[PDB]
Amino acid sequence: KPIVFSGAQPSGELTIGNYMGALRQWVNMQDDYHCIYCIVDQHAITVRQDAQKLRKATLDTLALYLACGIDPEKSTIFVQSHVPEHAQLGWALNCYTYFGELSRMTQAENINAGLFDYPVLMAADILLYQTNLVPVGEDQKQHLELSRDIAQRFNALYGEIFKVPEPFIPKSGARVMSLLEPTKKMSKSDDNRNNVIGLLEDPKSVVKKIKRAVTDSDEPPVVRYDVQNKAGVSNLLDILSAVTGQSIPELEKQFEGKMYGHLKGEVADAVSGMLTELQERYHRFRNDEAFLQQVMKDGAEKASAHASRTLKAVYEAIGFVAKRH
Amino acid sequence: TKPIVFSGAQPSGELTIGNYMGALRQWVNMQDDYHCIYCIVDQHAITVRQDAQKLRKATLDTLALYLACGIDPEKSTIFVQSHVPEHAQLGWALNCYTYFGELSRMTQFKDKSARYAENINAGLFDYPVLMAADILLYQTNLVPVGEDQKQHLELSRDIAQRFNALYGEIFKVPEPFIPKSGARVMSLLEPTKKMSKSDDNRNNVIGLLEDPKSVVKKIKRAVTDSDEPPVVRYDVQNKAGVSNLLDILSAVTGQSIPELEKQFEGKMYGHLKGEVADAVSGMLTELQERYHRFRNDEAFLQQVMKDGAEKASAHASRTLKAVYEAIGFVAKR
């Protein structure tokens, strides 16, 4: 099975876009690939933040990934800082990364060195596990390209130590746009929280956010799919289709002679119907301390076994004297 | 418990009389008075591109050389940097409390960048952060280094103070221990330039493992000055070469500059160089004699590395656990 690496940021609260897009896609491919989910707490600290909230958010993220259906018995899920090899390989790859490559990243004296240097750590995160495939958003494409360049550069000097990773090209295909701005994709980082539906929102909050969702001034109101002229209504249809599995033409027929109130009502009920099973699993996992501790221990153990084999090969190539165990 | 001493040296090139006088001499003398921890910094060495066989051999050379100098594994913790993962771990964490501008302004990064233009790498840039992690891991009170490491030392103090101010007394604030004499030994044919163990021109350098005969010849050819009459007087601005020779003689013999100036009153650079060459030849002959006994005893070197990494790991894991708890990581099981 090809090895797939994903970094999970411990800060973002996941939206229905994150879930019905990438996450649901990957949950159903856990037997197809050897999937690795790394909760990236070492990446998080490049932004100064409250310590207790970082600890909490690491555990929130673990429980939510578990709730969404990541299976600890099929996939490897772990906390980045629990596997020292990340930092170790990161230092080594720092020495085969050009300073120029980091300064050319699309992102002066007062930024912290972590924010400058984290694409090297990202390269180490991927290359440690002999990763074949990395799912990346547009913003992470430069970083993946750097990891490929580093891998090839090191391999040219020392032999085939690393796999050259490839982007995971096919996208989930569920379209989820922002509620008050239907041209912009729904993103966890959005400042306007009314643009998004988080995975932990109760039915009252979802009704409220969906009721405010932008539509159009068509007279009579008509539930028809048209991204150019009816962005808002189209987004509502795409969300409803994503939840229920009903086709757009089927939904267009279902809402014949119906107004946007009826659409919104069903969108809110559909979305909340999806989130209640998800929230039940989340709160059950999140408050089982022993379960979460066991997932983290098992995950770190699986990760370290793989990571240590790569690091040993890297260290031997560079020429370091092997540790006396 | 005793205050803690920590210092390191790279297994890159062959250590010089400069490395000895600025660092290793002080290391040896601090062993009973403080709890001393000495590191072969192989992770720092690779910021300059090394041949893999050269690096491995130089790591072991450097270890045997510490032992030959009088570093005693019964008194001091002696270890190889890459054997203790906590250095890289804490290094990453401290990256996040270090500013870009603090690193770009470093003289060492600038000098090494000019020298290795085809390999201006991120490790070379990030050099001081790993060095701060090396020091701060061991609750270090004193850091014996040469003058050239002063700026790096100062940043490690700033990082420690900065981190402590947010999170409490996690680190000790280290202090530099730079000797009065021999802190900046200069090149023999270019006494305005620091003696570098990887100098292209070997005649600039007195290597610790260099044939004494070769070293005596280098001392006789060291540049002095045009003063008429020749006078042996310490004066860095006007008499760089003569001063460097005096500095070297002082550090080997133990005699002060006034004592040496008095000794050479009415004498010229023949006497100065004759004495420097004799003192240094004798030191290197004896040093190299103990060195080969250690260097060819692989079982002893293996045991020293094993015991040292064990002792180091005990301290390092303790500090890292506290750092991780403070910054807010979920503790490993």
Ligand SMILES: Nc1ncnc2c1ncn2[C@@H]1O[C@H](COP(=O)(O)OC(=O)[C@@H](N)Cc2c[nH]c3ccccc23)[C@@H](O)[C@H]1O
């Ligand atoms: N010409 C000279 N005259 C006098 N002293 C000199 C001369 N050349 C070098 N030194 C000193 O020798 C020690 C080792 O040099 P390195 O280049 O390995 O030194 C270096 O490159 C350090 N970054 C290694 C290091 C890594 N981590 C540490 C933590 C604490 C102390 C030191 C370290 C140093 O003390 C250096 O100041």
Ligand SMILES: O=c1[nH]c2cc(Cl)ccc2o1
């Ligand atoms: O000091 C440092 N810088 C580092 C950068 C990476 Cl990616 C990893 C470890 C490090 O330690």
